[model samples]
Target: DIRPSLVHGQISKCAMDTPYIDKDMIDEAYQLTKSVWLKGMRDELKKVLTYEEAICGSEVSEYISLNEDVRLAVQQRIQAAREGKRLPVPMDFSIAFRMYYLGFIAHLMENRITNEVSIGTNVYSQDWSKTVRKLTKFGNKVIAGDFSTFDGSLNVCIMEKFADLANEFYDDGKENNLIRHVLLMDVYNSPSGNPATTPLNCFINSMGLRMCFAICAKNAGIKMTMKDFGKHVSMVSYGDDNVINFSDEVCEWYNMETIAKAFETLGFTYTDELKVPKWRSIKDVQYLKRKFRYDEQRKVWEAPLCMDTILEMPNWCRGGLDIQEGTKLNCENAIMELSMHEESVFDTWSKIIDRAYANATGDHLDINTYRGYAQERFLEYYM
Candidate 1:
């Protein structure tokens, strides 16, 4: 019998915390973070040149000259990549190169008005889900659209203008250097583990996406009020991933073409999946990680067994593998449950086998060796 216990076992108390991550893992993360910083800087430099008229204020010449420095810095980094040398530390040149742009983004964060239409910035993900559920009551159809590289696609000029509006209302003589410095450099180098990166990125991306939607709504003669706007459009953003829900009636006003153009105007692009409308019945919609399926016969929404819940079993057991025997039994049971469900068991099994192989051989199995062993065991047992 597949009791719920078999599917969702109690997590071992010993698995409460994970071991310290390997130094090599941290080094890999740092390298990836550094590369992202370089790419962001290079992309921003291009935007400064391409949108000079909109991006520059009184410091037009200064912006151009500073960007020239950015060009040289990026060029040197490209050379470093080819020469098998470490890229220069971002802190050394990032602040100087991105001073104006960082100030601009900080200003946007400080000034953008709060909107109920925008969830998942200051609010929790649960709150966003609650909002989505509330919206489903008003409409039968729901559509979600995701932005491609949303953080990178933000229009600096639009963000500046949004911030500029608040300047007229409140002139607090505050230096934005603190926020600027946080956003200026690599996430890996931050002393406090880059705590501000996710929130800051979410705030800016939400603001930019909101502005884009507002423009589209305005063009379609839709008023920005709860009665009108709330009925049609609601957006939930978590870092780069965003989901915009639109009611059926408003489909005429905000289809794929209009939505795509609105985002494009703000330097954002939709993922290929969102290039066309794929509106689904609200009963069968998937949002964030949960699949919300309405039971017509039962007259209720079924509790979604989320991907998070399933995947968390292995993660919980993995944490305590070195400390507790009971946790390993829990892990094996969870794998068996997963196998019955016909889920991808090899990857999870390999991780467990890797630890065992390392303990036996005094070294971790390389990818090829791990794959062979994992597949052999998988074929013998699960298949």
Candidate 2:
């Protein structure tokens, strides 16, 4: 029933037996296909290279509008998606291209303006642990304030226009496509997944905050030194959250009104809760999620053992009858990190587990079974 047949080879055999086949037609079709594909590629490149004026400016608003070039690019992508055409290039390619493009612009801006404004001002490290240690060692009175809608409040116009001015020098004598394209794509745009968004925003925010602090320092007629800045009326920021540490002597100069005004000039303001500003003793303040208290007898800053509220743990019944490896690893790492500072942290954690176990099932589990059952109830509620 399954004999070999020539039905599949009939067409090929006929073509081979005769000379009527048109090779030129096949060649023409191939050429047309290549041309169409290449045309699409050229169009995509043109879209990216097209220059448009950036419209972002100093008007206080709740949102930043995309510039014309970004809008056109987004529209083209939308049209392509609607027609179900394969994207000419991967989204990441554009993101990577923009990262380098924007990075150079940010470098120019920093060298031209931000560096001068940030003189004698401490820019806090992203490493929260190191920053906490420095704060404890340096500050006697720490005042922390959270910014309201920091990213949304940024003056996109100012950042773009400044970069535009910087790009003018390259435009004068040189003829580089990349530089010209950079001027066209003045503001970084990501409809959803642009990698440069966070860093660019952070850079701009840092520069703006530095300008704010420099204005305050100038207004108060206070000269700052690298060593003395931290001791007398020093302001440092981690993104939008800022902390000002000052000694008793310069406390009056760094008051709420002057600082708030300085920030307002740069299109920033403190959160409503911190609108009036609070100068609490160093011991009473919480910075970088670590609560610190001053030990009167020891004459040192102390970090009390506390659970990390941001720890990623599994949900109740999410893992069936067992804790996931990720949840276990997270718990272990958090416990170890806290235990390094306080050896009794494990015991404190055990007590917390015991209470949660009793509440959940009216039974207390031993330490041996703690890892197995901890996620069932404790992490879901407490963490």
Candidate 3:
């Protein structure tokens, strides 16, 4: 019987308080924050440009010099692929202005909300969740999108309400000049209607609103639990990526149903646009690139269960054995995750694997060993 036991279990929670996040508070912080683009401008711009190079290569960065050239070029390159979509193609002047104002506004928006939001508990908490913790500490930036159509527009009413917030601050004389500069620009004004959601707004709203939604889902699941289910299945998320663990069949259904409804409540249309919630047992779960399978013989979940093909590659017996047990290290995902410099003369997928494994294990990995391993995998999958 899979019974709940306090005897053998690791204490379910670690002591710590996580902060609550509030969307409304973010709006207010954004309103009153001294609108100065200088805070992170030099660093943020360079960071953004660096990110651009990582994505579209130096071609886009080179094209960024001229306004008309960048605008049409961005339109032409919009179909290039994932990195190209968020390519920082806006004219330098326009980018400078958005960099100046929106970045300033988003920075404060993130800070004020982080301070005022609710704290977290052991099982689930803002601090425990990787996504919210980073958000709480750093807040969002208005840099180019990483993987989506994130264009940085909020609800028209929200923006209009923000405009009103700016108006209130504008009356304070000290804030008026800064507010005036923002209101002068249409993009900075937080105008009416929803545009593509901005990265910063998404960051704030995701944690602020969604955390509450997650809380409700958790309670709903717990309410339906039995002793066999052991209180509740642990749930955690960073943005949309989520993980749910289950023991009792009943609790799984109860929790998943509640989470699905939580999505519905948040206007999730259950379309292909967003991720479809998945189901898997702890014994069979694949997490962070490693596979976990219950070993009935050993009566324990085994570690480092990567694909059979990966283990059978050319160098499995050598230093290649040190690759983390569950590491989903495969040529397919690596193609997307790892990129070599366009200008580099001698970088290859194999060397990249060698470097990654070496860095991860804090030991020197033979370049030839991992390279041969990657080459075989590449032939099987990509080739």
Candidate 4:
């Protein structure tokens, strides 16, 4: 195992990677982030602490990461699986842990990408590395475990913490009655956990697809659960199922109307399922397009690609411009093109992801859970 002092591993001393830097945008996003984080702390933590205690920045981020509501949910699922209310996941906890890790890294990177960059300067001149630094530092600290454990298994805790932070900070990866972005299109039918690849449904099988979804979840600030039996069935069936077939019959995932309908079957209303918060601009469709590899031969895309391809392109492409900004091969989560406009940078992207997934719809969620509760939730969590 890679070994070093925990402090050495955890601290951010150097510029790991600042692929895209923006200045005006860096200041703008820092303002937004600071504002949002402050507001988020007020809403989520105000009730739990005194006015004095709630004022600390580290306290809010740290405690929000340690919320007991999410912790109990993860624990309940693990125990329910053991008690037969749920089923064992096909992969080990570490694999699950890693999926959460990848999703998280991707999200934070996007957060940094969308915000905290400067425009006009080739350098990360936004002078907002502070935001990127803290974001990654917190992510590197992406951990969860049981205060109720014998040896402290950080299995689901990692994911739970991730889910909580994702929901609280960004408008991405939410579930239950809390948030409804990424309108799920398809009927949420299940026979698998794989993403769809057919003409009928929107594609969800490529690596770029995964990372983009990560952006969707992180920025949207929602954590969701797949409730369809078919959704949970595939996770129980393991990888034996060919689940992407549903792509052939649906489109646009689920719209607001459809999402509420599905939620109704499970007993949720429109208000509980939808979030109408305003975030200017949406996720960059162009940047998202680059992360996946589709096959005309099989008419299918690869299963995982986000982690590998975040750095695949030599530069971040801005349409109509002969630019190569996001081409850095480093896996650091310090935003991609920090040297662009605030509206054209990660701040806009984060706002978009927050708006879309928190209130949008798509097939990624409706069909993803067909694999199982574990599989589907992980997709929403990771995507």
Residue by residue across 164-213, what tens digits does model 1's lDDT show?
32222233223332223323333323301122244334444445444444
Q: Report, for every candidate in turn, its global Cα lDDT versus the true structure.
A: 0.40, 0.38, 0.31, 0.23
For lDDT, the strongest prediction is: 1
- Can you tell me which runs of candidate 1 are displaced by over 4 Å? 1-129, 149-154, 158-173, 176-195, 217-231, 272-275, 294-383
lDDT of 2 at 343: 34
Better of 2 and 4 by TM-score: 2
Model 4 scores a C-alpha lDDT of: 0.23
lDDT of 3: 0.31
> What TM-score, computed on C-alpha atoms, does each candidate reach?
0.42, 0.45, 0.30, 0.16
Worst 10 residues of 3 by lDDT: 138-147
Candidates sorted by TM-score, descending order? 2, 1, 3, 4
Off by over 4 Å in 3: 1-98, 101-198, 201-205, 208-254, 270-383
CA deviation > 4 Å runs, candidate 4: 1-255, 268-383
Model 2 C-alpha lDDT per residue in residues 156-268, reported as the tens digit of each score = 43344333333332233333333333432433443122223333343344444444444556666788422243345544343345455566665665555565565565455
